[PDB]
Predict the 3D structure of the following.
Amino acid sequence: GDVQNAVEGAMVRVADTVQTSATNSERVPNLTAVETGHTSQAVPGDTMQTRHVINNHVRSESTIENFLARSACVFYLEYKTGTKEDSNSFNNWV
Amino acid sequence: CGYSDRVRSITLGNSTITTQECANVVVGYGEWPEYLSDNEATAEDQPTQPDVATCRFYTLDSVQWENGSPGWWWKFPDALRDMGLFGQNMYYHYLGRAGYTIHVQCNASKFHQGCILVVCVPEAE
């Protein structure tokens, strides 16, 4: 929901692989036309016989929050202890 | 009963070993080998399981025990690399998984003495 409510979460997991068998069908799931600007939705089970696998992997360090939220150094500024006659006794950063 | 616990017959594939003197059989860590589940799979491709063709007793080379001899070791699965269709499947496949029944055979008459330790060390670096 709200992204300023940090105790409210959600959960989702990476997709599983369902077992498939050999075919000799009239459907082509791996032929497509790039021109369309459409990315193919082929999954391994479409061109191999795969076993049944369960994935419990979860995308969780590729969330926008987790990616950006680490403290980066943006600038350092220098200034001496001086008097009013000095022009380095204070300093500023835009 | 008519049973004795000194006779045992292990039949696996087309290969049977009999023995008329033995003391039980040690199942490593209490667990009997079995196929990989679908909760512990990582590979997506369909496994091959050659069953009877690759499970069977491969008799490796036999060394002579002498009074002065100090001991011997073999490294598995490396040792089985020339054994029939096990070797072939291992040669053509990137990943393999299997358990093993190790059966060491020796014999002597009553007027011999001597005692050998037979131990399977996992991960011996």
The two ends of chain B are 48 Å apart (CA to CA).
